[PDB]
Chain A
């Protein structure tokens, strides 16, 4: 009477929708596993987002560039929605964007440096009414959401440096359901993500974090 669970990435659907399912359960441990997976992914996942942006010709967020329909605050808002995928060892990196287009600037316009990946090619950073030279630098670092109260503002060295808030967590929605095959159950979880991190890898990471937390209890020791 031994059952061991397995992970299958099945029923992938939507632009970024996945339904990881485990064929084997302990016939009653399925609900606990689903609750743990749902809680861990939302608050334990770490994502890398821009925290600092410097415009070529700005002294503060509340300024208007010549021949630009978008406002500097509006440009910062467009920058925040941008989705970035980073290498495991990169930790922190700087992205340089310079464009002379007379059309609409875009996230894809960002220089294709190694490691840096931009999922949101479609999202446009700004729109230029007339031909002009536009350049800016955005700092990207790995981070996780520790809550609004426990947040470090971040030091700014350059006069032009502007602080930008970043939402590190990439999992928009988590759903789980339990089906009993008789003497055993199958766990079905629906995960919605920006697509920066593959769903199966994220599920494995969340389970690993839960196991690490439960590790202390079996020991019943400080360490």
Chain B
């Protein structure tokens, strides 16, 4: 950790500093999504219906 040049990298000359931001967002299936079967049958969801 202290073995680094002090920037953790060479940094490329002429670069004062850099910052890395990580964002994780959950995604849920919605209409227009594509579902493909193992047998090779594929389809795109058109609508979501009520359970009844």
Residues of A near any B CB (own CB < 8 A): 38-39, 42-43, 62, 147-148
Contacts and interface: CB of A to CB of B under 8 A. Distances in A.
Contacts of A38: 52
Contact of A43 (B24, B28, B48, B50): B50
A148 B48 contact: yes
Q: State which size class the interface on B falls in.
A: under 10
A42 B24 contact: no
Interface string B7-40: 0000000000000000010001000000000000
Q: Among the interface residues B24, B28, B48, B51, which one has the most CB atoms of the partner chain A within 10 A?
A: B51
Contacts of A39: 52
Contacts of B52: 38-39, 42-43
Interface string B41-52: 000000010111
12 contacts: A38-B52, A39-B52, A42-B50, A42-B51, A42-B52, A43-B50, A43-B51, A43-B52, A62-B24, A147-B50, A148-B28, A148-B48
B43 to A, nearest CB: 20
A148 B51 CA distance: 13
A197 to B, nearest CB: 18
Contacts of B24: 62
Contacts of B51: 42-43
A62 B23 CA distance: 11
A43 B24 CA distance: 33
Contacts of B28: 148
